[PDB]
Protein backbone atom coordinates (compact mmCIF):
# COMPACT_ATOMS: atom_id res chain seq x y z
CA UNK A 1 0.00 0.00 0.00
CA UNK A 2 2.44 2.67 1.26
CA UNK A 3 6.25 2.83 0.82
CA UNK A 4 9.46 2.77 2.87
CA UNK A 5 11.72 5.84 3.27
CA UNK A 6 14.02 4.74 0.41
CA UNK A 7 12.57 3.48 -2.89
CA UNK A 8 10.83 0.30 -1.66
CA UNK A 9 7.15 -0.45 -0.96
CA UNK A 10 5.86 -1.82 2.37
CA UNK A 11 2.70 -3.80 3.23
CA UNK A 12 0.73 -2.03 5.99
CA UNK A 13 -0.75 -4.84 8.07
CA UNK A 14 -3.45 -4.10 10.70
CA UNK A 15 -2.26 -3.85 14.33
CA UNK A 16 -1.94 -7.01 16.44
CA UNK A 17 -4.53 -7.28 19.25
CA UNK A 18 -3.23 -9.07 22.40
CA UNK A 19 -6.13 -11.41 23.18
CA UNK A 20 -6.14 -14.27 25.69
CA UNK A 21 -7.92 -16.93 23.59
CA UNK A 22 -9.64 -20.24 24.45
CA UNK A 23 -6.17 -21.83 24.75
CA UNK A 24 -3.03 -19.84 25.63
CA UNK A 25 -1.48 -22.18 28.28
CA UNK A 26 -2.83 -19.72 30.92
CA UNK A 27 -6.29 -18.85 32.28
CA UNK A 28 -8.11 -16.26 34.45
CA UNK A 29 -6.40 -16.49 37.84
CA UNK A 30 -8.31 -14.13 40.25
CA UNK A 31 -6.27 -15.44 43.26
CA UNK A 32 -2.89 -14.09 42.12
CA UNK A 33 -0.63 -16.14 44.43
CA UNK A 34 1.87 -18.23 42.46
CA UNK A 35 3.73 -21.50 43.07
CA UNK A 36 3.89 -20.80 46.82
CA UNK A 37 2.64 -23.51 49.23
CA UNK A 38 -0.90 -23.10 50.61
CA UNK A 39 0.61 -23.93 54.03
CA UNK A 40 0.42 -20.14 54.41
CA UNK A 41 -3.18 -18.78 54.72
CA UNK A 42 -4.17 -21.86 56.79
CA UNK A 43 -4.12 -19.50 59.79
CA UNK A 44 -5.71 -16.60 57.83
CA UNK A 45 -9.40 -15.84 57.09
CA UNK A 46 -8.41 -15.26 53.42
CA UNK A 47 -6.55 -16.90 50.51
CA UNK A 48 -4.19 -14.21 49.15
CA UNK A 49 -4.77 -10.91 47.35
CA UNK A 50 -5.74 -10.07 43.74
CA UNK A 51 -5.19 -7.29 41.15
CA UNK A 52 -6.28 -3.86 42.48
CA UNK A 53 -5.69 -5.13 46.06
CA UNK A 54 -8.66 -6.56 47.97
CA UNK A 55 -9.23 -9.44 50.42
CA UNK A 56 -10.19 -12.75 48.74
CA UNK A 57 -12.16 -14.19 51.67
CA UNK A 58 -12.52 -17.94 52.30
CA UNK A 59 -16.00 -18.72 50.93
CA UNK A 60 -17.73 -20.97 53.50
CA UNK A 61 -17.61 -22.37 57.03
CA UNK A 62 -18.68 -25.98 56.40
CA UNK A 63 -20.00 -28.46 58.97
CA UNK A 64 -17.91 -31.19 60.65
CA UNK A 65 -20.48 -33.72 59.32
CA UNK A 66 -19.85 -32.78 55.65
CA UNK A 67 -16.05 -32.88 56.09
CA UNK A 68 -16.26 -36.41 57.55
CA UNK A 69 -18.60 -37.40 54.68
CA UNK A 70 -15.97 -36.22 52.16
CA UNK A 71 -13.30 -38.43 53.83
CA UNK A 72 -15.44 -41.60 53.57
CA UNK A 73 -17.38 -41.18 50.31
CA UNK A 74 -15.04 -38.80 48.48
CA UNK A 75 -16.56 -36.22 46.00
CA UNK A 76 -17.11 -36.98 42.29
CA UNK A 77 -14.13 -35.12 40.78
CA UNK A 78 -11.94 -35.38 43.92
CA UNK A 79 -8.31 -34.61 43.11
CA UNK A 80 -6.49 -34.51 46.49
CA UNK A 81 -4.98 -31.05 45.95
CA UNK A 82 -6.04 -27.63 47.26
CA UNK A 83 -7.50 -24.90 45.02
CA UNK A 84 -5.81 -21.48 44.63
CA UNK A 85 -9.09 -19.47 44.60
CA UNK A 86 -10.26 -20.99 47.89
CA UNK A 87 -9.05 -23.44 50.58
CA UNK A 88 -11.79 -25.88 49.49
CA UNK A 89 -10.83 -29.05 47.57
CA UNK A 90 -10.47 -28.61 43.80
CA UNK A 91 -12.98 -30.91 42.08
CA UNK A 92 -13.35 -31.88 38.41
CA UNK A 93 -16.28 -31.36 36.00
CA UNK A 94 -18.14 -34.35 34.48
CA UNK A 95 -16.83 -33.41 31.00
CA UNK A 96 -13.16 -33.37 32.11
CA UNK A 97 -13.50 -36.73 33.91
CA UNK A 98 -15.06 -38.12 30.70
CA UNK A 99 -12.11 -36.69 28.74
CA UNK A 100 -9.46 -38.36 30.99
CA UNK A 101 -11.16 -41.78 30.60
CA UNK A 102 -11.46 -41.24 26.82
CA UNK A 103 -7.67 -40.66 26.71
CA UNK A 104 -6.89 -43.87 28.65
CA UNK A 105 -9.16 -46.12 26.55
CA UNK A 106 -8.26 -43.93 23.51
CA UNK A 107 -11.99 -43.50 22.59
CA UNK A 108 -12.01 -40.55 20.08
CA UNK A 109 -11.37 -37.27 21.98
CA UNK A 110 -12.48 -34.70 19.36
CA UNK A 111 -16.08 -35.56 18.42
CA UNK A 112 -18.09 -34.28 15.38
CA UNK A 113 -15.56 -36.17 13.22
CA UNK A 114 -15.88 -39.48 11.36
CA UNK A 115 -13.23 -42.10 12.14
CA UNK A 116 -14.03 -43.60 8.72
CA UNK A 117 -14.17 -40.89 6.04
CA UNK A 118 -14.49 -41.99 2.38
CA UNK A 119 -11.14 -41.61 0.55
CA UNK A 120 -11.78 -38.45 -1.48
CA UNK A 121 -9.37 -38.96 -4.39
CA UNK A 122 -8.14 -35.35 -4.64
CA UNK A 123 -5.33 -36.31 -7.06
CA UNK A 124 -6.58 -39.22 -9.26
CA UNK A 125 -9.69 -37.23 -10.35
CA UNK A 126 -7.69 -35.76 -13.26
CA UNK A 127 -6.14 -38.19 -15.76
CA UNK A 128 -2.56 -37.66 -16.97
CA UNK A 129 -1.88 -37.03 -20.62
Amino acid sequence: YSKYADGSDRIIKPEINPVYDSDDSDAETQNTIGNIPLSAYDEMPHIGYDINGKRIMRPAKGSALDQLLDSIELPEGWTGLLDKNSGSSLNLTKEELELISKIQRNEQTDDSINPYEPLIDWFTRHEEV
Binding site: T79, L81, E96, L99, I100, I103
Partner: protein, 115 residues
Protein backbone atom coordinates in the same frame (compact mmCIF):
# COMPACT_ATOMS: atom_id res chain seq x y z
CA UNK B 1 -39.37 -45.71 41.91
CA UNK B 2 -38.10 -44.22 38.60
CA UNK B 3 -35.33 -42.26 40.38
CA UNK B 4 -34.37 -45.56 42.07
CA UNK B 5 -33.36 -46.72 38.55
CA UNK B 6 -32.29 -43.30 37.14
CA UNK B 7 -29.78 -42.28 39.86
CA UNK B 8 -27.97 -45.63 39.41
CA UNK B 9 -27.21 -44.54 35.81
CA UNK B 10 -25.09 -41.78 37.41
CA UNK B 11 -23.77 -44.05 40.21
CA UNK B 12 -22.37 -46.54 37.65
CA UNK B 13 -21.17 -43.67 35.42
CA UNK B 14 -19.09 -42.15 38.27
CA UNK B 15 -17.25 -45.50 38.60
CA UNK B 16 -16.05 -45.37 34.97
CA UNK B 17 -15.29 -41.68 35.65
CA UNK B 18 -13.26 -41.75 38.92
CA UNK B 19 -9.45 -41.71 38.75
CA UNK B 20 -7.63 -44.98 39.51
CA UNK B 21 -4.11 -44.55 38.05
CA UNK B 22 -1.13 -42.23 38.67
CA UNK B 23 -1.14 -41.63 34.88
CA UNK B 24 -4.73 -40.29 35.00
CA UNK B 25 -4.01 -38.39 38.23
CA UNK B 26 -1.16 -36.30 36.78
CA UNK B 27 -3.40 -35.17 33.90
CA UNK B 28 -6.11 -34.28 36.44
CA UNK B 29 -3.52 -32.11 38.26
CA UNK B 30 -2.33 -30.59 34.95
CA UNK B 31 -5.97 -29.52 34.48
CA UNK B 32 -6.66 -28.44 38.09
CA UNK B 33 -3.59 -26.23 38.38
CA UNK B 34 -3.54 -24.16 35.17
CA UNK B 35 -0.95 -25.95 33.04
CA UNK B 36 -3.17 -27.66 30.46
CA UNK B 37 -6.73 -26.70 29.54
CA UNK B 38 -9.38 -28.80 27.72
CA UNK B 39 -8.09 -27.63 24.30
CA UNK B 40 -4.53 -28.83 25.03
CA UNK B 41 -5.61 -32.35 26.05
CA UNK B 42 -7.87 -32.72 22.99
CA UNK B 43 -4.65 -32.24 20.93
CA UNK B 44 -2.75 -34.80 23.08
CA UNK B 45 -5.69 -37.23 22.82
CA UNK B 46 -4.84 -38.10 19.19
CA UNK B 47 -2.27 -40.81 19.86
CA UNK B 48 -0.55 -43.63 17.97
CA UNK B 49 -3.59 -45.63 19.07
CA UNK B 50 -6.63 -43.52 18.02
CA UNK B 51 -9.30 -44.51 15.44
CA UNK B 52 -9.71 -48.08 16.71
CA UNK B 53 -12.94 -50.08 16.84
CA UNK B 54 -13.47 -51.94 20.15
CA UNK B 55 -17.07 -53.27 20.30
CA UNK B 56 -17.19 -55.67 17.31
CA UNK B 57 -13.83 -57.32 18.09
CA UNK B 58 -13.30 -60.67 19.92
CA UNK B 59 -11.98 -60.53 23.49
CA UNK B 60 -8.86 -62.69 22.90
CA UNK B 61 -7.58 -59.92 20.59
CA UNK B 62 -8.50 -56.85 22.70
CA UNK B 63 -7.00 -58.40 25.86
CA UNK B 64 -3.64 -58.43 24.01
CA UNK B 65 -4.04 -54.91 22.57
CA UNK B 66 -5.12 -53.18 25.84
CA UNK B 67 -2.13 -54.65 27.73
CA UNK B 68 0.22 -53.11 25.17
CA UNK B 69 -1.60 -49.85 24.30
CA UNK B 70 -0.28 -47.66 27.13
CA UNK B 71 1.69 -44.53 26.26
CA UNK B 72 4.26 -43.84 28.99
CA UNK B 73 3.41 -40.25 29.91
CA UNK B 74 5.58 -38.47 32.56
CA UNK B 75 4.36 -38.53 36.19
CA UNK B 76 4.83 -36.43 39.36
CA UNK B 77 5.30 -37.20 43.08
CA UNK B 78 2.47 -34.68 43.69
CA UNK B 79 0.02 -37.01 41.89
CA UNK B 80 1.26 -40.24 43.53
CA UNK B 81 0.57 -38.62 46.93
CA UNK B 82 -3.12 -37.98 46.16
CA UNK B 83 -3.71 -41.37 44.49
CA UNK B 84 -2.33 -43.05 47.65
CA UNK B 85 -4.69 -40.78 49.63
CA UNK B 86 -7.58 -41.86 47.36
CA UNK B 87 -7.13 -45.66 47.59
CA UNK B 88 -6.58 -45.79 51.41
CA UNK B 89 -9.76 -47.23 52.94
CA UNK B 90 -11.29 -47.05 56.44
CA UNK B 91 -10.01 -50.19 58.22
CA UNK B 92 -6.48 -49.60 56.81
CA UNK B 93 -5.22 -48.23 60.14
CA UNK B 94 -7.50 -48.97 63.13
CA UNK B 95 -6.62 -48.90 66.87
CA UNK B 96 -6.12 -52.70 66.73
CA UNK B 97 -3.42 -52.65 64.01
CA UNK B 98 -1.70 -49.59 65.57
CA UNK B 99 -1.42 -51.41 68.94
CA UNK B 100 -0.27 -54.55 67.06
CA UNK B 101 2.38 -52.51 65.20
CA UNK B 102 3.83 -51.35 68.54
CA UNK B 103 3.54 -54.98 69.72
CA UNK B 104 5.79 -55.91 66.76
CA UNK B 105 8.39 -53.18 67.42
CA UNK B 106 8.58 -53.97 71.16
CA UNK B 107 9.44 -57.60 70.24
CA UNK B 108 12.18 -56.29 67.91
CA UNK B 109 13.56 -54.04 70.68
CA UNK B 110 13.60 -57.14 72.95
CA UNK B 111 15.29 -59.33 70.27
CA UNK B 112 18.20 -56.84 70.10
CA UNK B 113 18.88 -57.27 73.83
CA UNK B 114 18.77 -61.09 73.49
CA UNK B 115 22.32 -60.90 72.06
Amino acid sequence: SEEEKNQTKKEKHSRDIDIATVEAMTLAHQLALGQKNKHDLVDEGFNRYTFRDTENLPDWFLEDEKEHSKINKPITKEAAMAIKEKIKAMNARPIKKVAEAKARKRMRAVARLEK
